[PDB]
Paper text:
OppA is known to promiscuously bind 2- to 5-amino-acid-long peptides, favouring positively charged side chains. We demonstrate that isopeptide-linked tripeptides (Z-XisoK, where Z and X are natural or non-canonical residues) are actively imported into E. coli via the oligopeptide permease (Opp) and processed intracellularly, resulting in high accumulation of Z and XisoK.
The structure shows a good overlap with previous ligand-bound OppA conformations and adopts the closed state, with G-SisoK enclosed in the binding pocket. G-SisoK engages in extensive interactions with OppA through its backbone and termini. The N-terminal glycine forms key hydrogen bonds and electrostatic contacts: its protonated α-amine interacts with D445, whereas the C-terminal carboxylate is stabilized by hydrogen bonds involving the side chains of R439, H397 and N392. Expression of wild-type OppA fully restored sfGFP expression with G-SisoK, whereas the D445A variant, which disrupts the interaction with the N-terminal α-amine of G-SisoK, did not rescue expression. The OppA–G-SisoK crystal structure revealed no specific interactions with the serine side chain, which is accommodated in a spacious pocket. This suggests that OppA binding and uptake rely primarily on recognition of the tripeptide backbone and termini rather than side-chain identity. Crystallographic analysis of the OppA–G-SisoK complex revealed a spacious cavity extending from the serine side chain to the N-terminal glycine. One notable exception is R439, which lies within hydrogen-bonding distance of the C terminus of the ligand and is replaced by glutamine in OppA-iso.
Author numbering: 27 to 543
Write the structure that this text describes.
Amino acid sequence: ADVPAGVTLAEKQTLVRNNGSEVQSLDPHKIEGVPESNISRDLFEGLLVSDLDGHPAPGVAESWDNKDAKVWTFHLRKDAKWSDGTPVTAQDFVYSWQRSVDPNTASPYASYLQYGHIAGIDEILEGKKPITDLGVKAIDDHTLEVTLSEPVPYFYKLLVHPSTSPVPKAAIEKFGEKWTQPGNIVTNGAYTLKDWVVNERIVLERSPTYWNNAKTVINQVTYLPIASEVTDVNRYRSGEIDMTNNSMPIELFQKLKKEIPDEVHVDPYLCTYYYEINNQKPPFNDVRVRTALKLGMDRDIIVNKVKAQGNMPAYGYTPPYTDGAKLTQPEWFGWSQEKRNEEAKKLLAEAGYTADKPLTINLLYNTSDLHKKLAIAASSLWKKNIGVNVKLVNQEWKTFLDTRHQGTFDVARAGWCADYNEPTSFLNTMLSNSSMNTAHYKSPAFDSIMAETLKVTDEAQRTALYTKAEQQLDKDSAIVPVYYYVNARLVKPWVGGYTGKDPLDNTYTRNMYIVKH
Ligand SMILES: NCC(=O)N[C@@H](CO)C(=O)NCCCC[C@H](N)C(=O)O
């Protein structure tokens, strides 16, 4: 943290914040959700980290170079240590990245390093070659060489993501699946695990072994797993939470803008709210049925329920304000809702679903006051607009994510946040082979377009190819886009270091401090 001169720090340097749900795991290779990453960024530090403006900055790697954006050499700082006193070495990153792509690890972020296209990754992920063939090697203890199969100038932006953090070989081989237990875990972040009580709290305490511990201010941070946005807000107002989750309850947000405007932060957020179609669950294997759902959803009615936050209606998957995206709105977005509804009922009727023989689907969503309200709305809209019956199923955050991977759902409330500020961070999730493809979308045409992005001469072509992928995704109605997120949360006036200028919202407890109150 960088405390401004003249600012008086408080006696007690503690922070409470709501994470929004109970985390999948504290194992960096066993997570895929934003809540999981919020804790991982405090516990584990990768090669690069996000600065206050969201730009890649030095982490364990103090400098780095590249040749043709193909061979990346990372120079690791020599005072980089684990929580057991052992130094963080290039070998840790070889082991860690080899583990992440091991079929036996079964990481949901297995395909992440495949977005960087590290040498020999393709055959390793499908279990044809061994993990030791991966194009990452320890040239020495403090020098890591990453060899890629094609040029990727945005490779370095990937390396802020927790699924790219080092993981301690000793602890994992000693404790197995018990390696993240409070007493056992070994961390290289600014914090280590003090306590973990399921559905109550995760307590981290400042790790003195951290190389930059001299600049850490917050001694202890608590993450709460409160799914109810109403309860989060109420506990914040009762003075028990310092920072809410960035999910605001539809009903109270207008009240909160009026009463505590100074404490209400709303900033750009590279995430898309959408209704994810299981493309392999009948009748959603039919593109006509999928298109009927896409058109039959009224975004304007839905967006007007969250108007106070100022969400823009969504016409695609990749946020158009994503760095290197010049997206075009599809013709159907320009139509009236009455015209979308007619065309949707026609397309349904072609597939043999009419008023007389109706379509009944299950809309899955993760426990939430925001998601329940917008689901009831969406359910009602689809019923009046295109005569589709929509029953609501709710599950806890962990089960929700599992259900979508297994493909045991019809349509799920979905929300993707960019891991790095580049359209591939989104678009690569819809690749046939991607471990993050919970849509189960398989288009050789879409895969072909994305493969073409790595054979490009200038960035102007790369941007155009991304727009063609978004168009193909839209033509195949892979998803029902609803609205592009904003980063809206409540932050007590005594919490400093939160600027909200990072559009990925990759904040670190080590960057924050408590002003006297
Ligand atoms: N790039 C990581 C990501 O976007 N992961 C998804 C998971 O598929 C996620 O965490 N997304 C964030 C949206 C869900 C988080 C919150 N609890 C809510 O439901 O509001």
